[PDB]
Amino acid sequence: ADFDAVLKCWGPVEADYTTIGGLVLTRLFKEHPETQKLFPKFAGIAQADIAGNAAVSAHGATVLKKLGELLKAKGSHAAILKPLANSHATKHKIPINNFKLISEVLVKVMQEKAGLDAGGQTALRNVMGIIIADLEANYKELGFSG
Ligand code: HEM
Structure with a gap:
């Protein structure tokens, strides 16, 4: 139910995954500057220079497309989230708390750009909580508990 609920507000996101993706990552790096260093391709770019950066926006589109794939899935969520x-645990080396941070940012960007209301915020927080708990479980199976 909450996946379908978030989709009621996903139109503006999927309309421009690159622009909205860039807003998400720009805001992540501005609000949580330690996260930028977890992207070696972006680490060191002056904050003022991130909003206009096409590579940052392209990677944000990759992120949001993956979330859209999850939302729209009729088949196994596990088949999408386990990889x-x-x-993220073994290649990118991302501490789990960072996923909470990007989820906070997405909620704000959807409030501002996608008409996310109180019920929609609930739903999105629920969906992101499911995602984060699954990531954390799969991290633990790999030996990552940090
Ligand atoms: C909504 C949560 C996230 C989603 C859906 C997501 C999705 C993705 C996807 C689909 C890729 C492409 C390669 C792959 O499959 O691993 C990727 C790569 C990557 N992700 Fe994430 N990610 C999320 C959160 C994060 C966070 C919070 C960080 C760091 C703070 C991070 C760091 C990275 C890095 C460093 C790469 C490799 C980039 C490259 O070298 O091109 N991700 N992510």
Whole structure:
């Protein structure tokens, strides 16, 4: 139910995954500057220079497309989220709390750009909580508990 609820507000996101993706990552790096260093391709770019950066926006589109895939899935969520945990724990080396931070940012960007109301915020927080708990479980299976 909460996945379908978030989709009621996803139109403006999916309309421009690149622009909205850039807003998300720009705001993540501005509000949580330690996260920028977890992206070696972006680490060191002056904050004032992130909003206009096409590579940052392209990666934000990758992120939001993956969330859209999850939301729209009729099949296994596990088939989509387990690889995501595997890569983020073992390749990218991302501490789990960062996923909470990007979720906070997404809520704000959807409030501002996608008409996310109180019920929609609930739903989105619920969906992101499901995602984060699954990532954390799969991290633990790989030996990551930090
Ligand atoms: C909504 C949560 C997130 C989603 C859906 C997501 C999705 C993705 C996807 C689909 C990729 C492409 C490669 C892969 O499959 O691993 C990726 C790569 C990556 N992600 Fe995430 N991610 C999320 C959160 C984060 C956070 C919070 C960080 C760091 C703070 C992070 C850091 C990275 C890095 C460093 C890469 C590799 C970029 C590259 O070298 O091109 N991700 N992510």
